[PDB]
Amino acid sequence: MNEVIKSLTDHRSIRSYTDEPVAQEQLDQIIEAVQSAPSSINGQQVTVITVQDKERKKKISELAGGQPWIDQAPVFLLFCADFNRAKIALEDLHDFKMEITNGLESVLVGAVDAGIALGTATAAAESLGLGTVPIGAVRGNPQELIELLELPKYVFPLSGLVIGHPADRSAKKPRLPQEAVNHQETYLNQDELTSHIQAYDEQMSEYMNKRTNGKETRNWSQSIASYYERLYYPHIREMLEKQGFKVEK
Amino acid sequence: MNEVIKSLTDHRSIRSYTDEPVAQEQLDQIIEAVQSAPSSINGQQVTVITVQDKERKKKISELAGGQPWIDQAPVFLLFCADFNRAKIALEDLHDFKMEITNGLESVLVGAVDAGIALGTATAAAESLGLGTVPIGAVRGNPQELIELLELPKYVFPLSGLVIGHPADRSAKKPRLPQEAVNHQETYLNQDELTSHIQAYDEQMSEYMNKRTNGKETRNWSQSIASYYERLYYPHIREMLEKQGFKVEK
Ligand SMILES: Cc1cc2nc3c(=O)[nH]c(=O)nc-3n(C[C@H](O)[C@H](O)[C@H](O)COP(=O)(O)O)c2cc1C
Ligand SMILES: Cc1cc2nc3c(=O)[nH]c(=O)nc-3n(C[C@H](O)[C@H](O)[C@H](O)COP(=O)(O)O)c2cc1C
Ligand SMILES: [Ca+2]
Ligand SMILES: [Ca+2]
Numbered sequence: 001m002n003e004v005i006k007s008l009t010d011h012r013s014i015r016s017y018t019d020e021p022v023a024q025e026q027l028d029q030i031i032e033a034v035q036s037a038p039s040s041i042n043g044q045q046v047t048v049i050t051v052q053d054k055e056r057k058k059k060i061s062e063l064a065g066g067q068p069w070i071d072q073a074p075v076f077l078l079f080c081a082d083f084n085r086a087k088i089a090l091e092d093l094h095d096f097k098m099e100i101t102n103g104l105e106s107v108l109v110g111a112v113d114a115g116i117a118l119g120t121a122t123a124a125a126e127s128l129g130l131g132t133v134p135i136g137a138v139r140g141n142p143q144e145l146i147e148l149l150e151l152p153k154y155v156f157p158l159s160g161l162v163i164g165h166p167a168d169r170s171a172k173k174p175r176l177p178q179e180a181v182n183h184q185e186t187y188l189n190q191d192e193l194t195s196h197i198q199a200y201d202e203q204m205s206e207y208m209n210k211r212t213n214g215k216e217t218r219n220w221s222q223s224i225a226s227y228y229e230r231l232y233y234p235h236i237r238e239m240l241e242k243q244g245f246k247v248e249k
Numbered sequence: 250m251n252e253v254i255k256s257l258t259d260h261r262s263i264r265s266y267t268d269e270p271v272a273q274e275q276l277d278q279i280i281e282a283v284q285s286a287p288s289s290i291n292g293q294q295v296t297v298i299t300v301q302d303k304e305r306k307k308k309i310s311e312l313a314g315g316q317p318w319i320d321q322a323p324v325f326l327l328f329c330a331d332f333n334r335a336k337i338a339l340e341d342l343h344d345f346k347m348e349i350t351n352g353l354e355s356v357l358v359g360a361v362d363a364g365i366a367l368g369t370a371t372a373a374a375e376s377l378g379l380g381t382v383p384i385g386a387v388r389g390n391p392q393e394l395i396e397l398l399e400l401p402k403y404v405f406p407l408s409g410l411v412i413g414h415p416a417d418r419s420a421k422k423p424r425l426p427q428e429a430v431n432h433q434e435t436y437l438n439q440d441e442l443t444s445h446i447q448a449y450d451e452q453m454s455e456y457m458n459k460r461t462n463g464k465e466t467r468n469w470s471q472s473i474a475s476y477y478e479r480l481y482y483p484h485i486r487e488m489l490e491k492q493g494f495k496v497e498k
């Protein structure tokens with residue numbers, strides 16, 4: 001196993017950080033890695049806002065449901081789907097009307113490009129010895145965040161990424177059995193898939209028990225069910241439309 | 250610069266492959282890397298279908314607009330957003346109704362998780378000396394692909410990833426100036442952003458010229474405008490709804 005695979009497979013989110021600053025040089029490397037990754041039609045439909053201002057970062061933390069690690073870490077990166085540069089290219093440089101944003105295809109393009117960026121940044125940062133944790137909660141109060149960071153039309157927040165020096169390196173969290181996630185040739189039959197999930201549940205409860213010394217024993221399906229039983233963010237379509245993205249009829 | 254950063258920043262898509270097989274051990278490492286990456290609420294909302302059957306892979310290539318490198322390479326991975334395992338967890342294991350899929354938030358969760366997976370797989374595969382190229386065209390004929398690979402309700406294709414041994418390692422393609430993609434504290438003013446795009450255009454035309462010996466000189470904005478002037482995939486919402494994903498009202 002080479003250094004890259006070793007680094008990728010040793011991943012774990014960090015939520016306890018020291019006050020040590022993150023060198024600009026390291027941030028540059030992380031950004032270079034992000035830019036170097038693939039993107040649909042080389043459209044580079046993702047923008048990264050680097051926030052290091054204490055006051056601004058604190059406000060972001062509050063908008064994200066008040067997550068202390070955001071305030072604690074020296075760096076907060078915001079990954080946004082971006083079709084504004086595309087708008088400039090089509091409308092301003094070639095006097096063309098941009099139509100891709102009038103259908104969900106644009107949303108998928110932006111979200112996938114942003115995920116590639118987030119995953120790449122995570123890999124890069126952690127290879128440098130830095131700890132990270134994505135923040136999907138930025139989608140909880142998108143309008144306020146959009147105004148705070150001056151995100152223009154055709155740009156919308158997808159996920160933040162906390163970066164800093166770990167104060168506690170934590171531990172790896174068990175993942176679903178490989179067979180349940182990677183299927184050969186065709187999608188796995190429902191019965192077998194269910195069996196893998198039930199086995200995973202036992203593994204997860206045991207993990208949580210010894211991890212929390214008994215404070216928490218919830219398994220995986222119980223956790224997933226506690227979140228998805230309600231559409232926790234019912235304002236997504238509204239956010240998208242307000243940012244110039246239309247859902248095709 | 251460490252090995253990870255060096256590998257990430259040396260990325261370039263490969264579209265010419267040899268007939269050399271991809272070792273199962275390498276595929277396992279790539280998959281382990283994918284599974285080890287972060288996912289929203291550890292929901293692992295992405296599934297990877299590994300296709301190595303010549304006939305099936307050929308059909309996929311045809312559905313993707315007939316891209317020869319898909320047929321040529323020994324491995325085709327399909328990254329799908331997956332809320333079917335979530336369905337099993339909520340409905341079958343806890344008798345709860347899944348509501349997250351009734352709003353676009355689920356679509357964003359799945360697309361971002363899949364992008365993280367795709368970016369991570371790309372990084373892993375290339376670190377092994379393998380060439381890769383994502384295939385967003387899988388979204389062109391989703392119904393046929395869904396039927397071919399037996400994708401159940403709550404699962405939808407986002408992007409394929411071709412993997413194999415390079416026959417031609419190609420070359421790196423210029424990216425937008427860092428300042429145009431990574432903004433400090435707030436989103437970059439429109440005027441400056443436009444200037445960066447125009448500078449990038451000159452860089453791109455020059456690159457294409459010497460790269461194609463003159464056969465092609467199109468710049469970036471011209472390329473982007475040639476694609477986004479129309480909603481090329483106007484059937485996305487339909488695909489999503491057919492797969493159990495609803496757009497909130
Ligand atoms: C989501 C996604 C979908 C893509 N779809 C295709 C495709 O269908 N066919 C193809 O040849 N390249 C595809 N690509 C590759 C891009 O064209 C390529 O990443 C971009 O031009 C940047 O060049 P590079 O990867 O060599 O650096 C895709 C990339 C991404 C991230
Ligand atoms: C898109 C996305 C959004 C996330 N949002 C948050 C968040 O708002 N707060 C948080 O503490 N963790 C967040 N996480 C981290 C997940 O909880 C974590 O990746 C998952 O539990 C797996 O644990 P691990 O990363 O330590 O391996 C997010 C991860 C992803 C990929
Ligand atoms: Ca079956
Ligand atoms: Ca401004």
Ligand SMILES: [Cl-]
Pocket residue numbers: 039040041042
């Ligand atoms: Cl492309």
Ligand SMILES: [Cl-]
Pocket residue numbers: 288289290291
């Ligand atoms: Cl989470």
